């Protein structure tokens, strides 16, 4: 195995695949392509780098971070000549020379084979929107494993992401212009993080394939495959207020800063704040075990009946931070029902937060 490749053509692929043999990258020269693979047994990332310079076929496994560090550590425009010799991988560039340990390619684990059942193409920017709109609402380490992940749902010509932790929910829907079957899968959060990281911001489309226990996304020269999660994901339709008689509108940043200040004097553990809505007015209050108090009064557009309702303020703040927009619409029922929060100018995403008593 021998190849010579420019630093900049190696860095991005290396970064993508890098994030005992599990600590190594499988390298393969075959058919004029170098392929770099990393895996944690649950998911797998593959990068394909065309080899334009002379090269010899073969496969090995090298420590992931050390090899990435060497290449990144090399000067801008460095040519990185690499060859297997005995039990070692030699890496050379200018007068920099490195000899890395290896493990047999034979020992590198392969994920089981599977069959694609649902497929679709979408702009990269669409997948970026879908994930960034919802990611933060995933549970962290809930004993309900299906909540530590993101629902990816197809319906009609829309792909939809949903995330909830049982107290708050995010949902986002985007048209992709293809006749899709009705279907749902749960991608574990680690897969979601990786899928988000492979989106370079370029105009290269993404290709999604969904199996019965797997999901695969192809963009450019990268192929990411992850296992899915078991269990019954909740239905976001149940969660959206069936009918809202109470509509609030306010600037996102004003609301954010008011809530952020009130957060200061909220209970450290429970984070509770009270909301008082009345004719064109929102009042936010907070207090902690030390009987310290915060009060915020804001001009809003609000026409319904007066009501008071409590929240975990970090749940509200997460929502407003995730809305990168001028105006926020809030839709209410009563003091003990969930609230729906949206961008005033766009219904693409909706955020639902259950109150505190």
């Amino acid at each position: 195995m021998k190849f010579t490749v420019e630093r900049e053509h190696l860095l991005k692929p290396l970064q993508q695949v890098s994030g005992p043999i599990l600590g190594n990258l499988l390298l393969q020269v075959a058919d004029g392509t170098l392929s770099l693979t990393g895996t944690d047994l649950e998911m797998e990332m593959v990068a394909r780098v065309a080899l334009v310079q002379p090269h010899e076929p073969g496969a090995t496994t090298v420590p992931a971070r050390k090899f990435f560090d060497i290449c990144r550590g090399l000067p801008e425009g460095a040519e990185i000549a690499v060859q297997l010799e005995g039990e070692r991988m030699l890496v050379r560039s200018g007068r920099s020379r490195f000899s890395l340990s290896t493990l047999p390619a034979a020992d590198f684990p392969n994920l089981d084979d599977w069959q694609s059942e649902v497929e679709f193409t979408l702009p990269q920017a669409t997948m970026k929107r879908l994930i960034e709109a919802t990611q933060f609402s995933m549970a962290h380490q809930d004993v309900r494993y299906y909540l530590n992940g993101m629902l990816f749902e197809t319906e009609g010509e829309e792909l939809r992401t949903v995330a909830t932790d049982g107290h708050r929910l995010a949902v986002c829907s985007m048209p992709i212009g293809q006749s899709l079957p009705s279907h749902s899968v749960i991608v574990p959060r680690k897969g979601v993080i990786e899928l988000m990281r492979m989106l370079d911001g370029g105009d290269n489309p993404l290709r999604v394939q969904i199996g019965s226990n797997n999901i695969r996304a192809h963009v450019g020269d990268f192929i990411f495959t992850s296992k899915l999660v078991d269990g019954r994901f909740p239905d976001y339709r149940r969660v959206l207020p069936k009918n809202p008689d109470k509509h609030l509108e306010a600037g996102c940043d004003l609301l954010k800063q008011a809530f952020a200040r009130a957060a200061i004097l909220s209970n450290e553990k429970f984070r509770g704040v009270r909301l008082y809505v009345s004719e064109n007015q929102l009042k936010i209050t907070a207090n902690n075990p030390e009987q310290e108090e915060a009060e915020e009064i804001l001009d809003v557009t609000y026409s319904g009946a007066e009501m008071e309702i409590g929240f975990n303020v970090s749940y509200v703040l997460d929502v407003l931070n995730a809305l990168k927009c001028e105006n926020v619409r809030m839709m209410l029922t009563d003091s003990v029902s969930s609230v729906q929060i949206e961008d005033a100018a766009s219904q693409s995403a909706a955020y639902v937060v259950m109150p505190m008593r």
């Binding site: 909830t164 049982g166 107290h167 149940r238 969930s338 505190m356």
Partner: peptide
Amino acid sequence: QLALF
């Protein structure tokens, strides 16, 4: 904190 579901 109330449960969403």
